[PDB]
Design a protein around this nucleic acid. Structure first.
Ligand SMILES: [Mg+2]
Ligand SMILES: [Mg+2]
Length: 133
RNA sequence: GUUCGCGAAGUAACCCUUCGUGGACAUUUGGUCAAUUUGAAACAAUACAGAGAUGAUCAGCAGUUCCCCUGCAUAAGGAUGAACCGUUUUACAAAGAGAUUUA
């Protein structure tokens, strides 16, 4: 376990030291947020992504990946509540809607998307958006 | 304890002493804290590692950090004060070609 313990500890010194110095460079956050996922600890990883939304919330690769780590282990109402916060923050975006729509397809629930497209049409988005509805 | 008044005692031209009493005067200090080993000074010495760039030797001045130290300091010094120079794979598709493959 010390063959493990000191591994995890030494990594969390190196990653934080760099992020300590560079608030930006999201490339590091996602990497380091991925490290804590592969240790099967969701609490730490969620903190990291939540810590990395403060730095920039306009960076969609970060938003998208933090949907993955929720969906991969199948924590539903988190990746569900998250999408409340996700598309209310950046309501214009394209990718964020479709990744919320297409993930609702594989959940087979068409009542959701019925009300989804209600709002997403209420927002008057544009051509390619309406055509999906 | 002082003073006012009263009530008694011995002496008493009513006063001095003595006793018993009513009232007034005066009215809530200090602790965030307990006296040596177990609620946290530091330095020196010893051993190990050695003080930026670059072919090599050097002057430095800044920036960034959930590092500080000497200094009256918003001056200036402290190795250019220190620490940092590592790691990096997905908003991701469009066209075509081969093969497997089912109503
Ligand atoms: Mg310096
Ligand atoms: Mg200096």
């Amino acid at each position: 376990l010390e063959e493990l313990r000191e591994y995890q500890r030494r990594k969390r010194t190196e990653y934080e030291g760099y992020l300590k110095r560079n608030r930006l460079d999201m490339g590091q956050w996602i990497r380091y947020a991925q490290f804590e996922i592969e240790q099967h600890d969701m609490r730490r990883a969620r903190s990291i992504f939540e810590r990395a939304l403060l730095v920039d919330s306009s960076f969609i690769p970060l938003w998208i990946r933090y949907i993955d780590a929720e969906l991969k282990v199948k924590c539903i109402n988190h990746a569900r509540n998250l999408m409340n916060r996700a598309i209310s923050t950046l309501p214009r975006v394209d990718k964020l809607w479709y990744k919320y729509l297409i993930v609702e397809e594989s959940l087979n629930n068409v009542e959701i998307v019925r009300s989804l497209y209600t709002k997403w049409c209420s927002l008057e988005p544009g051509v390619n958006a309406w055509n999906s509805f």
